Design a protein around this nucleic acid. Sequence first.
RNA 1: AGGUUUUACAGCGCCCUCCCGCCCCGACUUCGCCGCUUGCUCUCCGGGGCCGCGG
RNA 2: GCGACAGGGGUGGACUGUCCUCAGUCCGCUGCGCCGCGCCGCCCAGGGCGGGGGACCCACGUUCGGGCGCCCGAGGUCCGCGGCGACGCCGGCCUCCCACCCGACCCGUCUUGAAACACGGACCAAGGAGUCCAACGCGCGCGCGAGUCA
RNA 3: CUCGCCGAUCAAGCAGUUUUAUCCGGUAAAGCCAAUGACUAGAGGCACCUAUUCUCAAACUUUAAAUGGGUAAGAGGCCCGGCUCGCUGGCGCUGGAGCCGGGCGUGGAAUGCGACGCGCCUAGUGGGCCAUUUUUGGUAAGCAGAACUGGUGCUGCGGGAUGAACCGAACGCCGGGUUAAGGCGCCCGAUGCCGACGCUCAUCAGACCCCAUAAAAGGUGUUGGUUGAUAUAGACAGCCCGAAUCAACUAGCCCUGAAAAUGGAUGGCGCUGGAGCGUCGGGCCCAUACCCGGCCGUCGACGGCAGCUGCAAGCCUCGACGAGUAGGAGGGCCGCCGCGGUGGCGCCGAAGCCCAGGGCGCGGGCCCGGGUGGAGCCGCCG
RNA 4: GCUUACGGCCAUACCACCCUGGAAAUGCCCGAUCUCAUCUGAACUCGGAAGUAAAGCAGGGUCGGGCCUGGUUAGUACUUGGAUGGGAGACCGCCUGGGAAUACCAGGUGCUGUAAGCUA
Lengths: 180, 61, 49, 176, 157
Amino acid sequence: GVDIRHNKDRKVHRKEPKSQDIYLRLLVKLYRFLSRRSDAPFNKVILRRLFMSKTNRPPLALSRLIRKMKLPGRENLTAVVVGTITDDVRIQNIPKLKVCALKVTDRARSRILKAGGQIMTFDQLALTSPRGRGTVLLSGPRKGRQVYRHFGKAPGTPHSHTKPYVRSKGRKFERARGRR
Amino acid sequence: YRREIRMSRMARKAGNYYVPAEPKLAFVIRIRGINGVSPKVRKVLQLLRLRQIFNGVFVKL
Amino acid sequence: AKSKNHTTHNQSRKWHRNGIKKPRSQRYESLKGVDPKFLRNMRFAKKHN
Amino acid sequence: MKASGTLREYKVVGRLLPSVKNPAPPLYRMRIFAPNHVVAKSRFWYFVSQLRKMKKASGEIVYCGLVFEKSPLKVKNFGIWLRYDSRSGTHNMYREYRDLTTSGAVTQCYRDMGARHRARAHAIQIMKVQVIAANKCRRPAIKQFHDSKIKFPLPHRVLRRQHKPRFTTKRPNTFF
Amino acid sequence: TNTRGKRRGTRYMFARPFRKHGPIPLSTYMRIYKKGDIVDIKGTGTIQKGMPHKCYHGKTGRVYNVTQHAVGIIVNKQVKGKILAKRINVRIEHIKHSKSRDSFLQRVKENEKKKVEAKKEGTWIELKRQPAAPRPAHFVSTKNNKPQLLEPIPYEF
RNA sequence: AGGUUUUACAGCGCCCUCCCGCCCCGACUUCGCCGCUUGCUCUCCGGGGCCGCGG
RNA sequence: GCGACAGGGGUGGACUGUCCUCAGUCCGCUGCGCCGCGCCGCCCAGGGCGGGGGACCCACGUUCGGGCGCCCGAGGUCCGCGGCGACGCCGGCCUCCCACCCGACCCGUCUUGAAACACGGACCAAGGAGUCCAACGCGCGCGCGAGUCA
RNA sequence: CUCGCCGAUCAAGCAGUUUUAUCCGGUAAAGCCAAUGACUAGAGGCACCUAUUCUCAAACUUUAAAUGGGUAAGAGGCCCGGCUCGCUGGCGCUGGAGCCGGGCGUGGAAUGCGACGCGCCUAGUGGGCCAUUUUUGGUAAGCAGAACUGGUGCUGCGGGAUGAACCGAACGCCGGGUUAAGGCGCCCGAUGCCGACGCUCAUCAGACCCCAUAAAAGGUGUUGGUUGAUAUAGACAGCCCGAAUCAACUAGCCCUGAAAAUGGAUGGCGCUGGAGCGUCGGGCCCAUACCCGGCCGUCGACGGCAGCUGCAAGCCUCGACGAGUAGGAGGGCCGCCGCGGUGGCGCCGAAGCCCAGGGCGCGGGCCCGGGUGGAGCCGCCG
RNA sequence: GCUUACGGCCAUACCACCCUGGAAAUGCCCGAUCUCAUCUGAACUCGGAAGUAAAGCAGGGUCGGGCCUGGUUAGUACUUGGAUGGGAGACCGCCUGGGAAUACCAGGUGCUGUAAGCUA
Ligand SMILES: [Mg+2]
Ligand SMILES: [Mg+2]
Ligand SMILES: [Mg+2]
Ligand SMILES: [Mg+2]
Ligand SMILES: [Mg+2]
Ligand SMILES: [Mg+2]
Ligand SMILES: [Mg+2]
Ligand SMILES: [Mg+2]
Ligand SMILES: [Mg+2]
Ligand SMILES: [Mg+2]
Ligand SMILES: [Mg+2]
Ligand SMILES: [Mg+2]
Ligand SMILES: [Mg+2]
Ligand SMILES: [Mg+2]
Ligand SMILES: [Mg+2]
Ligand SMILES: [Mg+2]
Ligand SMILES: [Mg+2]
Ligand SMILES: [Mg+2]
Ligand SMILES: [Mg+2]
Ligand SMILES: [Mg+2]
Ligand SMILES: [Mg+2]
Ligand SMILES: [Mg+2]
Ligand SMILES: [Mg+2]
Ligand SMILES: [Mg+2]
Ligand SMILES: [Mg+2]
Ligand SMILES: [Mg+2]
Ligand SMILES: [Mg+2]
Ligand SMILES: [Mg+2]
Ligand SMILES: [Mg+2]
Ligand SMILES: [Mg+2]
Ligand SMILES: [Mg+2]
Ligand SMILES: [Mg+2]
Ligand SMILES: [Mg+2]
């Protein structure tokens, strides 16, 4: 026999979108052809995110997309995001965005188009930019869910700052012995 | 091969000795099995890339 | 009905199963526990430069 | 030590490692009988290590070669001074043998000590081997072969080749 | 079961050497410990204030905080199967500067001068430590040191 | 201890030698007294078993 | 060539000893390293290396490239062949019966340990044990998105 | 999931391992003529006192290992300039720390490896047992309790006759070759070698890890060895004779010591120029182990594809790998009943049942044929 | 080289006895008005300068004790790892590495930083 541990032979990486969506699996059939033959590091990152789940594809608000486009060097590039571009109602101006995403909400689609912008899809992106040139791949706040506020050391340890699971946030709910 | 013979002959000619240079290459062969190995010895056999019985590697000395 | 009291037999094999990882030394170590007189001045050396 | 086959005589010389305090240290010569040179080097670092203060890591072996017999075609009377460790204590012992080569005479000592005294190879320590003349032999088992015009038959020749004919009609003769 | 006292088993480690008792020599008090230097830990039974725990006597950590009489050290202590960085407060009478990194700093300063010397001269001196190589081939002369015959000695009781 | 005392009616050692006085056999796998090996050992160089799946 | 030392003379002096203006101690060749030269030594052209004054070997001969073949060459083919072919003289090897060689203790369960002189089981058929509701957590699919669910 | 995938094009970092460098300790040993405590004997100086002496410590130690523990081996570095502060203060640098800019790869020990990187959810378990070494209580225990590591529990295989743990070695299905431990009189594969040397006779011989018992004490059984004493100025033995002899001790094999109950156990037969003991040589025998090749599957790829295929949820290429209870997960063109779709079958014979019939799948199972039966049944996507 | 002040390492510096030394300095020494001080001007504090080496101090001496260093003890004791090694057992031998301690023997005995002054 051979002295080797088979504990971590399997690499747990999603190699196929767990969704049975038809249009999403067609984009996978498109970017798998580019991840093999285009020889561009952009298509290899879009292919991963087409597999990822909804929690690994968080929304991207307009304000969080506008600020990343106003950085120096993003003059006439595209804002690629594998997910939904939600609207940020507490922002006012839209500076002529050129985005490309799977879904765009009805208000975000209106504010981008009314400002003269352009909204694309991942099939049009692979048509005009097969190498992925002139793109700015963005993402949303993956650690922005309420679920991550409960993850930590423990609610009852020093320097925890972890949100405990309670039925209702009140006075008689876990504030007596250990919180003072 | 002929140089080490030359150095050994000129040392015996004068009654002296010529100690050859210690070897710089070694061929290690694992002979024992893989069950019942000490953790300090098992770690070395993994660094020598000798994980199964009857396999050989070259080791710089 | 006595039992076995204490043992550390299989513990060393369980420790090195997932390895004994040293603490991750990160750049820019924390500043908790430092002298409060020293930290109060250091925060005054950052809001004036 | 295993004492496999014929024990060949090796002349192993060695010395301490030269330093700045003791440059060119003294050289020590040894008379080692071992089956191969790998064991002969280890036997050198066993006796020299207990006679002088020098280990294998503190010194080096300068020469280790075979010592052939000068007269392999002449019967000689050898005398071997040894000391073996029995189950009780260590005992000095002087045994006389008779062979053509000193490599085979010491080999007979390891076979004799193991047969008569049950001594293994690691307990025996050969100290002196000397070609003794036929006048200074103390053992009567060798002195009987010191008779010129020696004469003796080979009585009761036991049948070997007992399996070449395994079945036959003739019983073997033992008088020749 | 043993007692969980803080000084159980410290009969010999916190003791002082033979004929080395008395007051602490005043050189250990005038040593400057900056923030980020490697210091050793060696408790002393003379100063019962701020003495380290027996699980740190002989360990080594780096300084992260300096106070009037003591020094905050970051020591890595393995508890069961995990190594944890412990922030302890030990007075300067139980610690001393670790010379484990002084051999590295002296080696760097010698490397920074060997490359600037080879650059302005045009050589290829290698700046890298190497293990003890096998001994080269050398001649052993027997002009005045003839090989002396050794042999085992007889057994005497 | 051969010949009647040391070579004699056999031989066995050890020294100075006459250049190693001089030639011939090289661990004998090259004529079966004893070791280590290629410095890539050479052979349509022999014989036996096993199976050639795929495309 | 020069450095580490070995042995004595002349001058001054400090000290020591119950031999006392007598004794003694002390202060002011050989070894290694380093080079340079000469000579000699390494199947002998030194068979350690590089250059100069009869046959075997040269991926040297004037720069490559192009057609036809062979094959110790990207894992086998025969452009070799024989006897039988009428339900019988051929074929099935798994299943049926039987024989022999090797192996082979009875399952379930509790247990550190069960073939156990530990328990349950004579045999066969049918039935026979992780469910549904409320609520919670995490992962995933979907819809919309600072909204969402009527 | 975040990356590295492209190897030191790159920064790397990591390690049940060494090397270099620097610290930690008070165990083994040693010591007590050194301290504390215990302890024997004389001697000198007028019970003490001094210098010696014998013997010890786990809760004593001057000294002090081996093994071992921590840390350091670079860009998060090194060096230089400027600035900030309410802290510090003879000394706008007096310290200190922060901030900003610039200069400088010969990544500045060996070996190995994709990072056992960052999280989330989480079952089972919480009676363990055994061995080498260390070690406590006990006369001892197949006893009780600890330490390091391995094994086992969860594990089959070759060897030890037999076997939980011993030795060798860990396991997909096979052909060939070769070994480990152990063996080669016959059972029983292999010495059916003209194997080498010596020891040994047993009226209870002996026959090899764990291991299945044997001691003190003895022998003029026999074979070696050590140290001495006598002897042609003639010993020893014998009632003069003329060449060796005697004593002590030691170590091998054998023997005495050695007595239990159903008949019996080197495994059995049996073996004595051996089939015994000791030291060794050559050859040979086979494990699911090693090597070469075929096949299945899993895993990985810094992978290959928009005459034949392309059911891309498909096909093709390469390399490594395969034990497993408790438990977890995936796959199922495995099986049963019912529903919405869909594609059928049936009195020219449905379901069920039976079979020494023909076959498929690793398997769960399935298809076909024959017989029986007499009215319903099934495939695929959900 | 020496004498002082403050030290660093803390016996190579300590301990017993003997000998020698005062240029500066140091010490002893001479007084109790003030400051202070105790049973007591011994000490402590204060004022002072007749004497100059008895002691402190410094430098030497001792087949000195101690301490320090080296040799040796010894590759001994012990120990890492290994074996289907020996042995009834206790225990022992060997292979692979590391490797002490007393006794005994020999040598040595303070080094040095900052500041001030003197050439006995
Ligand atoms: Mg084993
Ligand atoms: Mg328990
Ligand atoms: Mg208990
Ligand atoms: Mg366990
Ligand atoms: Mg042996
Ligand atoms: Mg207690
Ligand atoms: Mg010189
Ligand atoms: Mg049960
Ligand atoms: Mg129960
Ligand atoms: Mg029973
Ligand atoms: Mg029953
Ligand atoms: Mg049923
Ligand atoms: Mg939960
Ligand atoms: Mg870095
Ligand atoms: Mg419990
Ligand atoms: Mg639990
Ligand atoms: Mg048992
Ligand atoms: Mg127990
Ligand atoms: Mg029990
Ligand atoms: Mg297991
Ligand atoms: Mg048995
Ligand atoms: Mg086979
Ligand atoms: Mg057998
Ligand atoms: Mg008797
Ligand atoms: Mg007798
Ligand atoms: Mg007599
Ligand atoms: Mg007996
Ligand atoms: Mg293979
Ligand atoms: Mg499996
Ligand atoms: Mg139902
Ligand atoms: Mg005087
Ligand atoms: Mg003295
Ligand atoms: Mg000493």
